[PDB]
Write a protein that binds this ligand. Structure first.
Ligand SMILES: [Zn+2]
Ligand SMILES: [Zn+2]
Lengths: 163, 365, 365, 163
DNA sequence: CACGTGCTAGCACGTG
DNA sequence: TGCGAAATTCCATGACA
DNA sequence: ATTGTCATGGAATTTCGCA
DNA sequence: CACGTGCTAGCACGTG
DNA sequence: TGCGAAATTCCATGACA
DNA sequence: ATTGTCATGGAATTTCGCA
């Protein structure tokens, strides 16, 4: 229909378990559907409980029209569906075992998945502290398909920390 | 009796002639419209002026009139003003009758994330054992972040600003010389991330105007929301943060969200005007809005203001003056005039101080 | 869908014609220069306006623009202002943008001892176990008496004022509604001596301006005298009292002593100009000075002030508002307009209050 | 020489002992030489000590050119002469046993002396409390020789408590 | 004892 | 007369709260 | 039923000493 | 521990 | 065009300190 | 070495619907 924009769709997923860095065994991955921006939230478990804690911090900044995820327990709960409706966030669901995305999101969720793991052996079981730097790299990473960074597409200006 | 040739009828510069200068009791007198007054020698004046002034450490006129009662000489005020410039106590206690120069309206930061303004709101009413809010206002857009803290410490300022800088890093962070901000630990944290710390002049909160004036909207809305309810605000910072970022400045026509993103997110009354453009055709338009945004210019000077020149004698408002203690420090000198409104002084201690002219009065005489 | 005849092409008062009003999704839309907006029925508007305003309890413009994003109807602002007049929290928290009317300059009391102005200075630094000063300023002359007290009690106000009234009795005594002054004991003491107690409006110290402004000269001189010394002021009240009474007001040309006696006593720089007249020829001249003394007139009104009319909706500055609590009481009504600057209101409790317009803002809408 | 004025001369004297009203056994009498105004100060003894206490309260209001008194101990002391000089008050002394005054002062010191004593039996051994009323009467008393009150000659207007 | 009215304290943090 | 310097008046800006 | 005030010192302005 | 800098408490009195 | 009503812009006044 | 700001609502003013 009409052109893609940010906040149109946030793609979420958990990653873990990981090596216990200060109790945080998982990571919540939120990626803007159009700019491929990335937010990362260290959680202690992949529960609605901590999925809410985190998406609140996020939805205090900006609010997606749609959240899209796998049918992971945390995402399919009533708790979460109630939390969603409350804010006018539409829920969309990747039909089981056959994951769904646009090109962009598939690769970004990949970049992370691997970039996380490299700075998991290279800088070992103390990863918690580094998620902010990860997130910055991720959002300042250059895009082939659109020759602009997430930090550029999102804010419309150059990062003050280029990569 | 040295310039006494007037007794013989000789003329001395500055003494009128159409009077008659006689002698009585052993004192040189003069017949005047006012009455009959006593002229003392040059040697005896400075002392008399002092005696008179000292009665109530009176100003120019009030000091003269006391002397008017008994004496006349040429340009008495000339001698009286000389004395008020020397009286230490008057100079350090009398307030000023000269207003500061008109305010500067600093250019709005160019891009979002150029400048960050911070301050701490509180102590507040204990909500979930939190007592303060760290307010972080972006210069250009006026996008604002709200972090609940248990104290206004570096310890916890750092904590918040990390969660913040995950989104982006700012070039410059500006704050009041608040304890937690002028620590070395904060200097570190900022050096590490390579961000320049820029500091307001002391006791001059207009400098942090952008935050303070956001504080206002923050306290105001908090109140409207906590009416009739007991004040538990912790759970409201989220609600306030979003709402405020997403409220139009009438003179700008734009919400801070818009000035930061170019489209609304999924918040009530979502503006869709730029729906049909590509993100690229849209992000361009934003670069445009940001450039031609309304901006105020300095208001006209007050009829009786003053502006600081180098090497001028100037005094500094006492930090927190004691009870019955003078409100001004010993007079000092202007070294550098950073702008029409900020000055570096040879401090009274005797350091370098960068102070606002507001905390300054020009030394009189 | 009730005023929907626009779908067939019928005209309804206040709706323009050079547009086209279609239907989509089940909603009456309109094509506009702004974009394409949604017109809801009359029944659905009041609610929408509220939804919008409630987001940040926004003012007129900021509230409209949020609705602008989605809707158009005839004179939306008309509906929005209607709502801001009904929102309780906004009315009791938003400050005012209307300034008080210009100040009155009450006629100087006619004779010495017509009016007495009193206030208490302190707590001060403990000198001989005294902590306060009772300042007594005579209206007409500005002659001032200084009584050291151990507390600001009726107990001790009475004590002082007796020693005072031995000289004369005043017609009227004016004070701030300070605890010790609004006691019944003081009412007694004053009734007995047959003196009328006249009281300032609450939280409005300009009312006691004559004292307060003498306080200033009292604190100021005390300080100049206590420089470098530790602050023991008890033994200085005498010295200050005399000195102040005997210092010229430049715009009057006269010391309060002079305005009270017609000749100086035996104090330094004693004016003798009326030496040769009889006491009778002298006391007459005084009656003259007192009549033609300089007097200021009210300054011009501020471009955007307000003045109170009877039965107008008006709200009162909250006494001592709590933290995060609104700064204005529930709106009220003007009963009596005592002058352009004082008003008696149907209080919120729901008494009679005589308040200064300064502690009042006109209710908006 | 030149016409009489107020503050030109204050005439002082002690009166007592009197019946112990709250310890005050004496009274200091100060009368303006020209207006015949009267101030009264209850003291515990006719010492320089309490003569100073009292004349301070007075000389904080206004200051005489001259004080004149009998050669009473309190008045002739060094202490008092030092106190006097300090303020530029000239001391004058009624040559012993043959008291000195103008007409006016002689009668006023009399008025008091008797007016005190009447409200000493009529209202008995509690007199302290009444000195202010005495003083007011005294200063609002009408004058034959000049047809004006002390309170009129001093302030140049009518008392707000006429007598 | 809490409430209305006229005054100044007080506490925080980081550093020396 | 009119002109330069002195002297007196004008006033807005702050501190009392 | 009550109401702002006045010391202060550059600047503006009116008076003064002398022709 | 006192000092510099950015915040709100606090205490008084007389009456109900 | 030009006129009345609507709608948008102007701005000084306060609160953040 | 640094600098006041902006929601607000009557009032003033510029744009609008219709001839
Ligand atoms: Zn002085
Ligand atoms: Zn509201």
């Amino acid at each position: 229909d009409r052109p893609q924009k940010p906040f149109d769709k946030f793609f979420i997923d958990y990653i873990g378990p990981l090596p216990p860095s200060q109790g945080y065994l998982y990571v919540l991955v939120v990626v803007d559907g159009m700019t491929g921006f990335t937010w990362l939230y260290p959680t202690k478990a992949p529960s609605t409980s901590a999925t809410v804690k985190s998406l609140n911090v996020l939805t205090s900044i900006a609010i997606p029209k749609v959240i899209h995820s796998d049918q992971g327990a945390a995402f399919t709960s009533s708790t979460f569906a109630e939390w969603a409706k409350e804010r006018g966030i539409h829920l969309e669901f990747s039909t089981p075992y056959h994951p769904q995305s646009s090109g962009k999101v598939e690769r970004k969720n990949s970049d992370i998945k691997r970039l996380l793991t490299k700075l998991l052996v290279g800088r070992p079981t103390k990863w918690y502290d580094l998620l902010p730097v990860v997130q910055l790299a991720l959002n300042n990473t250059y895009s082939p398909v659109l020759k602009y960074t997430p930090h550029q597409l999102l804010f419309g200006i150059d990062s003050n920390t280029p990569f | 009796a040295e310039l006494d040739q007037l007794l013989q009828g000789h003329y001395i510069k500055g003494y009128p002639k159409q009077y008659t200068y006689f002698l009585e009791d052993g004192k040189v007198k003069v017949s005047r419209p006012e009455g009959v007054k006593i002229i003392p020698p040059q040697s005896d004046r400075q002392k008399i002026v002092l005696q008179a002034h000292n009665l109530a450490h009176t100003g120019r006129e009030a000091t003269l009139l006391k002397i008017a009662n008994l004496y006349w000489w040429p340009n008495m005020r000339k001698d009286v003003v000389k004395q008020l410039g020397r009286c230490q106590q008057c100079l350090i206690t009398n307030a000023s009758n000269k207003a500061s120069g008109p305010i500067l309206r600093p250019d709005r930061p160019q891009k979002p994330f150029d400048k960050f303004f911070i301050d701490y709101i509180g102590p507040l009413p204990p909500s979930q054992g939190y007592l303060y809010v760290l307010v972080v206002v972006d210069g250009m857009t006026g996008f604002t972040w709200l972090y609940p803290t248990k104290a206004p410490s570096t310890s916890a300022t750092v904590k918040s600003l990390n969660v913040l800088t995950s989104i982006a890093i700012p070039k410059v962070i500006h704050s009041d010389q608040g304890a937690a901000f002028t620590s070395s630990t904060f200097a570190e944290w900022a050096k590490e991330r390579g961000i320049h710390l820029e500091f307001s002049t002391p006791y001059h909160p207009q400098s942090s105007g952008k935050v303070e004036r956001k504080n206002s909207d923050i306290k105001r809305l908090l109140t409207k929301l906590l009416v009739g309810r007991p004040t538990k605000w912790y759970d409201l910072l989220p609600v306030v943060q979003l709402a405020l970022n997403n409220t139009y400045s009438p003179v700008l026509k734009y919400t801070p969200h818009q000035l930061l993103f170019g489209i609304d997110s999924n918040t009530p009354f979502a503006n869709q005007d730029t729906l049909d453009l590509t993100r690229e055709e849209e992000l361009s338009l934003l670069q445009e809005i940001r450039t031609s945004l309304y901006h105020p210019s300095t208001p006209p000077a007050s009829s009786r203001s003053w502006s600081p020149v180098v090497g001028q004698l100037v005094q500094e408002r006492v930090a927190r003056p004691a009870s019955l203690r003078p409100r001004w420090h010993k007079p000092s000198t202007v070294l550098k005039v950073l702008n029409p409104r900020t000055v570096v002084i040879l401090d009274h201690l005797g350091n370098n101080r960068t102070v606002s002219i507001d905390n300054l009065k020009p030394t009189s005489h």
